[PDB]
Design a protein around this nucleic acid. Structure first.
Ligand SMILES: [K+]
Ligand SMILES: [Mg+2]
Ligand SMILES: [Mg+2]
Ligand SMILES: [Mg+2]
Ligand SMILES: [Mg+2]
Ligand SMILES: [Mg+2]
Ligand SMILES: [Mg+2]
Ligand SMILES: [Mg+2]
Ligand SMILES: [Zn+2]
Lengths: 38, 130, 8, 101, 82, 46, 222, 162, 175
RNA sequence: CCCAUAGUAGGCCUAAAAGCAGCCACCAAUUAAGAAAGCGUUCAAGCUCAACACCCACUACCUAAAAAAUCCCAAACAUAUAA
């Protein structure tokens, strides 16, 4: 997870999900694509 | 909401409407198989083995073929056209050849059609062949 | 049995 | 296709799809046939035979699946969506895969 | 070291024989037949630039085949920057 | 104007009504008339 | 049968010989000796120059006032030239090179002792001015991406526009004023000195009409 | 509606679907010109989170919302009911639409806190440890901004932030 | 899987680029060279033949050899050795419609065109398309005198091109 | 979401340039698929996108944060007729 003010999907396997009141980018193919809304 | 002016029919639809009429008028056997998802090679090969007996393989969208059949005499062929549908049309009934080529693929279903202006089923063709 | 302005 | 192909047809001995094409309730079963008959799904297991039976007796469509373990799955598509049948089909594949091994 | 076999350079032969049609060592050059021995559609082929959308008939497959290619070209142009 | 659907595979054999008239017409005719008809039929079919 | 539509044609379009943006100098060739007053009004209010399209069909539209120093020009030039297709696209500057001298005093100095020495040059810009104009055999969607990237990096609010979107912008603002249901408008109250309001307004507000505050442009104000 | 029954007999599973009784819309809507169930019955801007008789018609047996394509609601009303159902669940007004629990699962006792007009999910909200000044006070949202246009019978408008 | 590359008739060698690909996938390079050279023994050496090597899971290879590439057929029928460096601006060759028709008859037997059961008209339209990319101009009728004139002019143009290339190469040496 | 065969590895340059280092063309087979829009390969393979078929995705096309030092800081409240 890297904090980001603007969330961007970096590959086709990235998916946006809202959990615990904030938006996250999750990616199983490339875990480095994981992002947390700042 | 005010309806929108009906969109004018596209020139391709007219050409498809005319090719369908011709295929339906200038042929005798008009089988209707389900265009299963065979590989490109297998589809091409099976289409060449049918062409050995000059059994053409047509493919028309179900949005042009349906309107035509609705207003045409073949009003009972509609139920068949729910999904992918290829036509196996020949100018002279060559059912036995088609049937043996169609039996090489166990999962390709022959749904029916109309030979000599007579709407048949699958067993009808298997009977017309014998 | 519902008028033009009836509201449930 | 791709979703089912990812699971594979390793524990499926035979799949038989019986429908009456002239009937008006076979759309779901025919869509199921299109998915299972895909080159990708079939390529997963070449020993599994997909058999499509076309009948005009007027009976309701049915899908019979025979697994290697000997258990069978009968799905009646008269009042079932293609997605529902495929979902149930995949679940049984997962169950029969762990049992055999 | 690998290249094609030597090509002919005789105007008489190149205009009276199809040099590369015969690929077998034991075969002979293919003599060009007279004009009357070729089908009519051969001499009606479009030897110039491709017909434009305006020239094509809106009720022919060629017209819509040309429009689909132009749309793919446009989609590629728009997608390049995206 | 709309051809009839295909009969069920298990349903009893059904013959079109238009031929039912032809079946009866043949019985009424005489053999000598049927014979003359046959001579022209055989040649016409060849 | 997916319905195709005719694609736009750019056969009549012609690409200049020099499609890329030219180099902008830090300072004028002849250095200015006379130091000038600050004159902040040169970035205040609506723009009167370079508000319309000339050669191209796409541009970056200023939505505020600000000064463009050489660093900004390099950002604009390198970004557009690197991103544009020289064969099918051309770009021109719609702003002059930095010409207004900015003075700076020595670090650590006290107030007084005369004006500071000239340090660098800037280009004043007003809201509504086109900053860079692009054209060629392309659509707005092709250049909108990198033009918006440049607009975000400018020292004032800016947005990539086209001949169509710019005209739609102006038409929408005119329609909002015509269909506005508020019986009270800033223009009416200010020009009639209703409530003695001009005691808290600037003489410029008679023409700005509440749409401009300092260097900031308020597009939702009617 | 359509059900699905799974029966395992003789080491064989049979999957079947049956059509059960389906409810029908009441006859003679007061506003036939309406384009969705809400405006056909003049209910726009006239329902709240506690109108479970209305809300319960658009949810699944386990509390889930129904698709907009099936119910026919418009995007605007479909979103309003969506928020209203979340608030109804959180208020405890739908005790017979609880989530499905797998066999052998019994939730552990949790502290009971009565609440209503709950916009957010309890677990996703942090305490307001620093309230801030009066001119920049951090407020606690109450209700939903989607219902801001509901008919107001008082002279004071709905306060959505406490 | 299927390995598809153009291999010249009778000149298969264990070197790159086909060799490494065959080795990486487990197929023996020497065996293929022997089999291909034997089955391409009746074809003039140096003819580019598109080959399709079907590799089975046990690393036994089947080769499917087709008709020569249309680039060869058009180059040989024109008497040219290399295609145009800027097609559409320079005419590198000149053939007649009769030449294209004769090429279509042989190319129509290829499995790509044969399996589609397309009329010879479709194959001729395809060959004309490839010719427009080689710089070869298709004309309805060509005389022996007209071909000599073009060959004379083409030789001059090609000679100047060599001089220009030499200048660039010589300039690069001075750099 | 679904799906992908083919003249052909277009020619040129290049040790190699095979849709995808560059230059030129950008025609054509199949009902349908750019001489290729994005990745990838030393070059190839390989994964997508634009195609067909299937068929109501029946898309919004406005953007978007936070940290300080003694101890948060009125209490509270969505519902009864504008006064
Ligand atoms: K900015
Ligand atoms: Mg095509
Ligand atoms: Mg190709
Ligand atoms: Mg090449
Ligand atoms: Mg290339
Ligand atoms: Mg490829
Ligand atoms: Mg490359
Ligand atoms: Mg696609
Ligand atoms: Zn990713």
């Amino acid at each position: 997870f890297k904090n980001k003010t603007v969330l961007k999907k970096r590959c086709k396997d990235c998916y946006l999900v809202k959990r615990r009141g904030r938006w996250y980018v999750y990616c199983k193919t490339h875990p480095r694509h994981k992002q947390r809304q700042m | 909401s005010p309806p929108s002016p009906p969109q004018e029919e596209i020139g391709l639809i007219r050409l498809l409407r005319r090719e369908i009429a011709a295929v339906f008028q200038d042929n005798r056997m008009i089988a209707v198989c389900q265009n299963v998802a065979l590989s490109a090679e297998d589809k091409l090969l099976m289409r060449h083995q049918l062409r050995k007996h000059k059994i053409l393989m047509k493919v028309f969208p179900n949005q042009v073929l349906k309107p035509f059949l609705e207003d045409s005499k073949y009003q009972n062929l509609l139920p068949l056209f729910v999904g992918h549908n290829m036509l196996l049309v020949s100018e002279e009934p060559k059912v036995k050849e088609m049937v043996r080529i169609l039996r090489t693929v166990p999962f390709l279903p022959l749904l029916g059609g109309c030979i000599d202006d007579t709407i048949l089923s699958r067993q009808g063709f298997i009977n017309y062949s014998k | 049995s519902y008028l033009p302005g009836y509201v449930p | 296709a791709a979703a089912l192909a990812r699971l594979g047809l390793r524990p499926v001995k035979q799949v038989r799809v019986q429908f009456c094409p002239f009937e008006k309730n076979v759309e779901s079963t025919r869509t199921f046939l299109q998915t299972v008959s895909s080159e990708k799904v079939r390529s997963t297991n070449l020993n599994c035979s997909v058999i499509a039976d076309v009948r005009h007796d007027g009976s309701e469509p049915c899908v019979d699946v025979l697994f290697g373990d000997g258990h069978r799955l009968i799905m009646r598509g008269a009042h079932l969506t293609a997605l529902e049948m495929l979902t149930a089909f995949a679940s049984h594949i997962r169950a029969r895969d762990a049992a055999g091994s | 070291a690998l290249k094609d076999p030597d090509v002919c350079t005789d105007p008489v032969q190149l205009t009276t024989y199809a040099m590369g049609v015969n690929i077998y060592k034991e075969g002979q050059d293919v003599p060009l037949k007279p004009d009357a021995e070729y089908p009519e559609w051969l001499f009606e082929m479009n030897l110039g630039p491709p017909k434009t959308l305006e020239e094509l008939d809106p009720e022919s497959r060629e017209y819509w085949r040309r429009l689909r290619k132009q749309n793919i070209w446009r989609h590629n142009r728009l997608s390049k920057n995206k | 104007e709309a051809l009839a659907g295909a009969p069920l595979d298990n349903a009893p054999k059904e013959y079109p009504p238009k031929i039912q008239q032809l079946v009866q017409d043949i019985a009424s005719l005489t053999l000598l008339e049927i014979s003359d008809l046959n001579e022209l039929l055989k040649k016409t079919l060849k | 049968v997916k319905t195709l539509l005719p694609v736009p044609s750019f056969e009549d379009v012609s690409i200049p010989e020099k499609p890329k943006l030219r180099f902008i100098e830090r300072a004028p060739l002849v250095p200015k000796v006379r130091r000038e007053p600050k004159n902040l009004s040169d970035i205040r209010g609506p723009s009167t120059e370079a508000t319309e399209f000339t050669e191209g069909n796409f541009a970056i539209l200023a939505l505020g006032g600000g000064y463009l120093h050489w660093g900004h020009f390099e950002m604009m030039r390198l970004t557009i030239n690197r991103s544009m297709d020289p064969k099918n696209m051309f770009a021109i500057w719609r702003v002059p090179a930095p010409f207004k001298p900015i003075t700076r005093k020595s670090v650590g100095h006290r107030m007084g002792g005369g004006k500071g020495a000239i340090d660098h040059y800037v280009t004043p810009v007003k809201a509504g001015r086109l900053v860079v104009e692009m054209g060629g055999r392309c659509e707005f969607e092709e250049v909108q991406g990198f033009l918006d990237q440049v607009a975000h990096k400018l020292p004032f609010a800016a947005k990539a526009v086209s001949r169509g979107t710019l005209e739609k912008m102006r038409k929408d603002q005119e329609e909002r004023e015509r269909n506005n249901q508020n019986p009270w408008t800033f223009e009416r109250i200010a020009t009639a000195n209703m409530l003695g309001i001009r005691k808290v307004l600037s003489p410029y507000d008679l023409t700005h009409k509440g749409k401009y505050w300092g260097k900031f442009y308020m597009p939702k104000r009617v | 509606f359509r059900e699905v029954v799974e029966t395992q007999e003789g080491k064989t599973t049979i999957i079947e679907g049956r059509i059960t009784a389906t409810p029908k819309e009441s006859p003679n809507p007061p506003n036939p010109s309406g384009q969705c169930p809400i405006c056909r019955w003049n209910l726009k801007h006239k329902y709240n989170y506690d109108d479970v008789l209305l809300l319960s018609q658009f949810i699944r047996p386990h509390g889930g919302m129904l698709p907009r394509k099936i119910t026919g609601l418009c995007q605007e009303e479909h979103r309003k009911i969506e928020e209203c159902v979340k608030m109804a669940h959180r208020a405890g007004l739908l005790p017979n639409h609880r989530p499905r629990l797998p066999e052998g699962v019994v939730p552990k006792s949790k502290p009971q806190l009565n609440r209503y007009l709950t916009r957010w999910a309890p677990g996703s909200v942090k305490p307001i440890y620093k309230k801030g000044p009066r001119w920049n006070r951090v407020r606690m949202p109450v209700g939903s901004p989607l219902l801001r246009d509901n008919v107001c019978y008082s002279r004071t408008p709905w306060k959505l932030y406490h | 899987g299927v390995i598809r590359a153009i291999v010249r008739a009778g000149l298969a060698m264990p070197g790159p680029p086909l060799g490494p690909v065959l080795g990486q996938r487990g197929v023996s390079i020497n065996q293929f060279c022997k089999e291909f050279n034997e089955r391409t023994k009746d074809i003039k050496e140096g003819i580019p033949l598109p080959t399709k090597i079907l590799v089975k899971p046990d690393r036994t290879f089947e080769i499917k050899i087709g008709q020569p590439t249309v680039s060869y057929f058009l180059k040989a029928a024109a008497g040219i050795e290399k295609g145009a460096r800027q097609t559409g601006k320079e005419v590198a060759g000149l053939v007649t419609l009769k030449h294209v028709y004769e090429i279509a008859r042989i190319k129509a037997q290829d499995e790509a065109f044969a399996l589609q059961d397309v009329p010879l008209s479709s194959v001729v339209r395809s060959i004309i398309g490839s010719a427009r990319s080689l710089g070869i101009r298709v004309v309805k009728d060509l005389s022996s005198e007209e071909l000599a004139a073009f060959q004379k002019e083409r030789a001059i143009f090609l000679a100047a091109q060599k001089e220009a290339d030499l200048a660039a190469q010589e300039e690069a040496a001075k750099k």
